[PDB]
Amino acid sequence: GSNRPNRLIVDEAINEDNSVVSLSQPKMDELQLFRGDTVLLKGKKRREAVCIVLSDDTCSDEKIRMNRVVRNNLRVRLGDVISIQPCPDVKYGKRIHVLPIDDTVEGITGNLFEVYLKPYFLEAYRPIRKGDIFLVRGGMRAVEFKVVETDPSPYCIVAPDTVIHCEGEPIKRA
Amino acid sequence: FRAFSGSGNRL
């Protein structure tokens, strides 16, 4: 381990991607992180997220850039504090189950896997965690999905062979 | 719904 303090102040993203957070190069070096590393982010009350880390030359050394989706998963606001640590060797998922949030799919017609999930996950090797809510663009409107279960649990890589389940009743917004 | 009900979808 690097032995160094691993708390960072939450800052906004420049490129919106649900799976990425960004640090300065000095901070990456302090924490022995490489670009594309899987990292585990922690907030309070056991809230967690798995992301990939990238290096951004405009990010302040004591901050972490993360989008609104990741911030909501961690239950933080801009300016709140999280921790970041290595999460090596995240296993490839056998299967995951996601369900849409009801108010994001009300009235929609069309196959949610083809329009939303397949292009989102295809050949992207996204890390994901049980309990995540993630926003996907497609069609006419953006859809939010909750990760109901993963196998392995609670997190995995959504790899080419990972089976994607999305049958069931849409979930109420919490 | 229960978890992993059905055949799922392949990428």
Numbering used by the authors:
A (entry chain A): 19 to 192
B (entry chain B): 225 to 235
Task: Give verbatim excerpts from the published study on this entry.
p97, also known as VCP (valosin-containing protein), is a hexameric ATPase of type II AAA+ family. Thus, the functional diversity of p97 is realized through interactions with many different adaptor proteins, which are primarily recruited to the N-terminal domain, although some adaptors also bind the C-terminal tail. Then the p97-Ufd1-Npl4 complex extracts ubiquitinated client proteins from their holding environment, subcellular membrane or multi-protein complex, for subsequent proteasomal degradation.
In this initial report, we present the crystal structure of the complex between the p97 N domain and the Ufd1 SHP box at a high resolution of 1.55 Å. The final refined model for p97N-Ufd1SHP complex contains residues Asn21 to Glu192 of the p97 N domain and the full 11-residue-long SHP box of Ufd1 (225-FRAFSGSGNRL-235). The current crystal structure further reveals that the Ufd1SHP (225-FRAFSGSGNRL-235) binds only the Nc lobe, consistent with the recent report. This short β-strand, βSHP, binds to β11 at the outer edge of the central four-stranded β-sheet (β8-β9-β7-β11) of the Nc subdomain, thereby extending it to a five-stranded sheet (β8-β9-β7-β11-βSHP: four strands from p97N and one strand from Ufd1SHP). Two glycine residues (Gly230 and Gly232) generate a sharp kink in the middle of the SHP box, thereby enabling the bending of Ufd1SHP upon binding to p97N. However, in the present study, the SHP box was observed to bind at the far-most side of the Nc lobe, which is distant from the inter-subdomain cleft where the other four p97N-binding modules bind, and this observation was well consistent with a recent study. Mutating the Ufd1SHP residues reduced the binding affinity to an undetectable level in the ITC experiment, and mutating the p97N residues also abolished most of the binding affinity.
